[PDB]
Structure 1
Amino acid sequence: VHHQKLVFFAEDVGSNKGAIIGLMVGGVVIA
């Protein structure tokens, strides 16, 4: 099994006020 660039951005990102996760297996995230 091989994972790569699971989430890809190719230009500007203004701002992030939420959650950006690549691989989510467990735990709690509150953004």
Structure 2
Amino acid sequence: DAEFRHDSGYEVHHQKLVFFAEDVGSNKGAIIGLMVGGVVIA
């Protein structure tokens, strides 16, 4: 077989931004942090 199913099942590639600016697989790594804080004064 010589098929390269990228968008299999459903076409998810809507933003060709990654094609426009190219890609290197991973930008060294990946860092994500979520900060949640609530203040209650009463």
TM interval, short-chain normalised: under 0.3
Gaps of 5+ in 2: 1-11
Larger radius of gyration: 2
**Greater RCO between the two (CA within 8 Å, min separation 6)?**
1
- The number of residue pairs the alignment matches comes to 31
Identity among equivalent positions (%) equals 100
* Moved segments of 4+, more than 3 Å: 1-26
More strand, by proportion: 1
CA RMSD of aligned residues (A): 11.6
More helix, by proportion: 2
